Amino acid sequence: KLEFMEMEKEFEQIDKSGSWAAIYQDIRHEASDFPCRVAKLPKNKNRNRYRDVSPFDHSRIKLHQEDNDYINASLIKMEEAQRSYILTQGPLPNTCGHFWEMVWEQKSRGVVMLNRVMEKCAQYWPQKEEKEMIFEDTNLKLTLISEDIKSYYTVRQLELENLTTQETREILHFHYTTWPDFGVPESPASFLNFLFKVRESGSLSPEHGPVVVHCSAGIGRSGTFCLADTCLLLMDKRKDPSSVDIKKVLLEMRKFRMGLIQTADQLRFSYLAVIEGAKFIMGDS
Ligand SMILES: COC(=O)c1ccc([C@@](C/C=C/c2ccccc2)(Cc2ccc(C(F)(F)P(=O)(O)O)cc2)n2nnc3ccccc32)cc1
Ligand SMILES: [Cl-]
Questions:
Q1: Renumbered to this chain, where is the cross-link N,N-(cysteine-1,S-diyl)serine (Cys-Ser)?
Q2: Residue 140: Cβ within 10 Å count
């Protein structure tokens, strides 16, 4: 029985009544709030891209660093969906070493980037194979191994080396290049293809640390990506796909980092991509 017909019928109802803005505002104003005391310390001012975008103390990633353990990065743990993500801001010129430090320490194998370096964000990875990067502060080396450019995203293989131990790891970089700030992806299809590619790569697997997802602030596009991924896992893990309340899921995620999903349009897009994504996986796969 087409249960997807019932939930696409009410998506059409929200579209027809023009109710996306009200629904999104109702989410914003129900969102939880927690202290961000460490983000707001004097010494950490230059470690934050944006004045108001801060990680909650309870969910922030700690660098393994005695001097200063702070990075603007939050751990999103989705218990029922059985998925963890790290959401972070676009690295600053002074935080690139901290970023790769975080990647190493958290044993992530995948980085998901949803913004562009020039739209901001530092060039935190090598653009050229023959020109490696050394992060002197954190004692790490990064080399671009491969780069596969498509029209709406780019997939890169990176080698991250700990210069202290000399161990190296392969890091997969999934860069969605056509998603404007406060905007939407080019299409549901392009979004879903990008997401399925991340999934198939093994980067989201519990064998590894959490995937690192970032945009510029690490809240709007980052929140949209993770919401869509989480809701798809829930629609598959559950007996009833229509039981998945995207509002309830977003609020849950927002317990771990503020401001996730930044526009009513991004919310609507997340619903659309989840409905389309669930048709695909729960239909002929
Ligand atoms: C022309 O507009 C801007 O230059 C601009 C700059 C910063 C911002 C955000 C606006 C602050 C939003 C916010 C902060 C705390 C909780 C919830 C929302 C930061 C922000 C930038 C981009 C995004 C995004 F959605 F494009 P992402 O996809 O990269 O995450 C989000 C946020 N911000 N953070 N502190 C601020 C202080 C004064 C004014 C704006 C401030 C918004 C617009
Ligand atoms: Cl918000």
A1: 215-216
A2: 21
Cβ distance 23 to 14 under 8 Å?
yes
Task: Work out how many domains the chain is built from and give that number.
Answer: 1
End-to-end CA separation in angstroms for the chain: 18
Is the four-CA dihedral 43, 48, 51, 53 of positive or negative sign? negative
How was this entry determined?
X-ray
Domain holding 103, by residue range, is 1-285
Ligand 1 pocket residues where CB is under 6 Å: 50-53, 115, 181-182, 215-222, 258-259, 262
Residue whose C-alpha is closest to residue 203's, from 173, 224, 230: 173
Q: What is the CATH number of the domain that holds 18?
A: 3.90.190.10
Who's near 277: CB < 8 A, 6+ residues apart? 192, 195, 228, 232
Whether 192 and 170 have beta carbons less than 8 Å apart is answered as no
Pick from 219, 250, 267, 270 the residue to mutate for probing ligand 1's pocket: most ligand atoms within 8 Å of its CB. Answer: 219
Which of 36, 96, 121, 215 is flagged as catalytic? 215
Resolution (angstroms) equals 2.1
Closest alpha carbon to 222 in 97, 140, 126, 121:
121
